Design a protein around this ligand. Structure first.
Ligand SMILES: Nc1ncnc2c1ncn2[C@@H]1O[C@H](COP(=O)(O)O)[C@@H](O)[C@H]1O
Ligand SMILES: [Cl-]
Length: 372
């Protein structure tokens, strides 16, 4: 008779929102369980419908999976809420966050691998889903399932125990997995270590409540998950100091960083809230280099439409075009998404400056080379 996991109100609200023609139309997708052969419903909204005070959503979870019961639907799997970059929304501006949020501020690196949700049902089933798919898509759900079973065998923990512990806490584990079949990202990642990383744990409720990272680590050691680096800053001023110093330095712990995911609790009602701080440079310059490289490999055309980093991009083309012309093997891997970072650093070595050092004296050097 336990109605503590009944979510039929939210199910009714989602079904009603499904019929809405154009604004806030609930998107429904029925998947089949890979273990129990039963069915689970995945709900999802349009991205442009998120994060707007004029568009109230029944739930704000990126990834939501509910059971297929007409008298007691239960949230099988829940992901994080949709959270946005700084200044992207009026409630992620650099001034509103200090006023309306408190500590403790937790900073993790931006994920690079595929995201998977691991939960458990009453029947001991270990339900592994991915971006709105459990049938199964990217099929990273099944890849991560194989990784998880392999790592559970390595510690002798049966998947039944993990499913039962998830069910008893009514939690979904959000995990990032990075296979070697994955492509390279523009900025290098020092936590490649192919396997399953545990990004967090959420309670399967309509509202967003996530475990603190220490509990996540304790759960991960209990189930052979690869731990994730993070740092804690108690106040907003310390966090702004760390973020601005890291941006002025471009190195977190001797590594190139694309972005940070920062978790905190809102000052009013003490609810969890995430926001992203993305370092625009040197990500933009490197991605422009990669795009012009792919354009040359596919067309042998070195004309580009960019307005920023034009001189350094032309120098990069001067250095790299002979390499691409005379190394057909490098072109194939580059098009497949490999060797981007190595070729980038080869150019950075030829030019004699670091990427940040290039960015610092760039208008100086561009105007100087134009003047000559
Ligand atoms: N560590 C992370 N950094 C950035 N986005 C994340 C992370 N973990 C999960 N996401 C979610 O992934 C989605 C965007 O991924 P993508 O657009 O494929 O880069 C959004 O729903 C994010 O909230
Ligand atoms: Cl509800």
């Amino acid at each position: 008779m336990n109605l503590s996991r009944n979510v039929k109100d939210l199910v009714e609200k989602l079904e009603a929102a499904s019929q809405l023609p154009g604004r806030g139309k609930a998107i429904k997708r029925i998947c089949k369980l890979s273990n129990s052969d039963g069915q689970v419903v995945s709900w999802k909204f349009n991205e442009w419908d998120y994060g707007k005070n004029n568009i109230k959503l029944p739930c704000c979870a990126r990834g939501l999976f509910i059971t297929d019961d007409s008298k007691n639907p239960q949230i099988v799997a829940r992901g994080y809420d949709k959270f946005f970059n700084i200044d992207e929304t009026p409630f992620t501006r650099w001034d509103t966050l200090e006023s309306d949020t408190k500590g403790t501020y937790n900073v993790t690196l931006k994920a690079n691998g595929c995201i998977i949700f691991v939960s458990g049902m009453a029947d001991g089933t270990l339900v592994v889903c991915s971006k709105h798919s459990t049938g199964p898509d990217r099929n990273h759900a099944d890849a991560g399932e194989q990784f998880l079973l392999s790592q559970l065998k390595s510690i002798g923990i049966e998947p039944q125990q993990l499913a039962l512990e998830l069910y008893q806490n009514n939690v979904t584990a959000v995990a990032e997995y990075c296979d070697d079949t994955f492509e390279e990202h523009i900025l290098e990642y020092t936590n490649d270590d192919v396997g399953l990383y545990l990004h967090g744990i959420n309670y399967n409720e309509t509202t967003f409540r996530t475990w603190d990272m220490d509990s996540v680590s304790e759960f991960a050691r209990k189930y052979n998950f690869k731990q994730i680096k993070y740092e804690n800053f108690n106040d907003f001023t310390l966090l702004k100091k760390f973020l601005e110093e890291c941006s002025n330095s471009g190195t977190y712990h001797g590594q190139e960083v694309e972005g940070f995911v920062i978790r905190c609790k809102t000052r009013e009602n003490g609810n969890d809230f995430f926001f992203k701080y993305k370092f625009e440079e040197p990500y933009l310059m490197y991605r422009q280099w990669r795009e012009v490289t792919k354009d040359y490999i596919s067309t042998k055309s070195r004309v580009f439409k960019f307005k920023k980093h034009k001189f350094i991009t032309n120098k990069y083309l001067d250095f790299v075009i002979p390499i691409l012309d005379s190394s057909p093997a490098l072109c194939e891997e580059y098009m497949k998404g490999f060797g981007i970072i190595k070729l980038r650093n080869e150019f950075l070595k030829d030019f004699g400056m670091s990427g940040l050092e290039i960015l610092n004296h760039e208008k100086v050097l561009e105007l100087e080379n134009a003047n000559k």
